[PDB]
Amino acid sequence: IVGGYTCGANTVPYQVSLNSGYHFCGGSLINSQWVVSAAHCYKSGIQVRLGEDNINVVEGNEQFISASKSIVHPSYNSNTLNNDIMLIKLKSAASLNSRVASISLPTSCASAGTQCLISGWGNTKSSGTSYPDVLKCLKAPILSDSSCKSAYPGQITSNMFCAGYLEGGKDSCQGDSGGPVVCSGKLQGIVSWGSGCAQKNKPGVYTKVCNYVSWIKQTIASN
Ligand SMILES: N=C(N)c1ccc(O)c(CN2CC[C@H](NS(=O)(=O)c3cc4ncccc4s3)C2=O)c1
Ligand SMILES: [Ca+2]
């Protein structure tokens, strides 16, 4: 996260860290046994880390659970990043409490102008690389579709939306991918991509979760 602030230990209880010997992507806990992340984050040998703040120190409240299976959307296209969504089933159910809780799926899509909270352990610099120890947060509004398509001509599908600041300086970045975009208590987006980080006229692009609620429910129901 570039231009954000320190969230505060366990203030984003649904935030998850995908680990394979190091942190590589974020995710959101949607129920005691399922995590939602980005398809481009897929890799074998994933360990889901819950209740984390400082990802480099065991401070208590952490729960490390191996992924039993990862389900990348069947129509995911790595070239365009369309349908950048993946479901992860935990080997065992997580222990829900105040520091570890699930986030609700949306019943309808969010409107432009809606303020959301984006979080993650990604790069905090728009120039070089600087990874934080603790979880970073950023409040950002959903942009209009025309503004989004104007910024990224020919690269925005109906399954994506822009969020952030056209003035640059505040954005999500590498390492934040797969993470949550929560608006009004509902998971509306997944950190997917952008051109560089926090650059002028190049906001972040996110997977439009409201377009996948039926797929998520049907997939979870049969697995
Ligand atoms: N600004 C952000 N919110 C953000 C978030 C996560 C990232 O990892 C990056 C860094 N990222 C991710 C890739 C992007 N590279 S690129 O501009 O060549 C593009 C490649 C590509 N492939 C398919 C569709 C569209 C494109 S744009 C970049 O800087 C940026
Ligand atoms: Ca820790």
Q: Quick one: DSSP state of residue 171?
A: B
Contacts of 63 (CB under 8 A, 6+ apart): 49, 50, 51, 94, 95, 100
Nearest to 159 by CA among 43, 103, 77, 222: 77
Please give the residue range of the domain that contains residue 90: 13-102+211-223
Ligand nearest to the CA of 50: 2
Cα–Cα distance measured from residue 141 to residue 44, given in angstroms and rounded to the nearest whole number: 34
Annotated resolution, angstroms: 1.8
Contacts of 24 (CB under 8 A, 6+ apart): 18, 41, 43, 175
Contact yes or no for 106/188 (Cβ under 8 A): yes
Which token pair is 210?
A: 């409201």
Query: Ligand 1: which atom is nearest the Cα of residue 78?
Result: 23
- Whose Cα sits closest to atom 16 in ligand 1? 195
Q: Are residues 176 and 93 in the same domain?
A: no
SS3 label, residue 134: coil
Q: Are residues 27 and 57 in the same domain?
A: yes
Query: Ligand 1: which atom is nearest the Cα of residue 198?
Result: 1
Q: Quick one: DSSP state of residue 22?
A: S
- Whose Cα sits closest to atom 17 in ligand 1? 195
Cβ < 6 Å from ligand 1: which residues? 80-81, 155, 171-174, 176-177, 191, 193-197, 204
Catalogue the E-assigned strands of 73-110.
86-90
Task: Confirm or deny that 54 is annotated as ligand binding.
Answer: yes
- Whose Cα sits closest to atom 25 in ligand 1? 80
- CATH code: domain of residue 94: 2.40.10.10
Query: Ligand 1: which atom is nearest the Cα of residue 204?
Result: 3
Q: Are residues 160 and 63 in the same domain?
A: no
Cα–Cα distance measured from residue 128 to residue 200, given in angstroms and rounded to the nearest whole number: 17
Contact yes or no for 12/23 (Cβ under 8 A): no
Q: Are residues 26 and 133 in the same domain?
A: no
Q: Are residues 39 and 54 in the same domain?
A: yes
Active site positions, annotated: 40, 84, 177
Q: Are residues 38 and 114 in the same domain?
A: no
Catalogue the E-assigned strands of the chain.
5-6, 15-19, 23-31, 34-37, 47-50, 63-72, 86-90, 115-120, 136-141, 160-163, 180-183, 186-193, 204-208
Q: Quick one: DSSP state of residue 41?
A: G
Nearest to 161 by CA among 122, 125, 119, 113: 113
Contact yes or no for 136/1 (Cβ under 8 A): yes
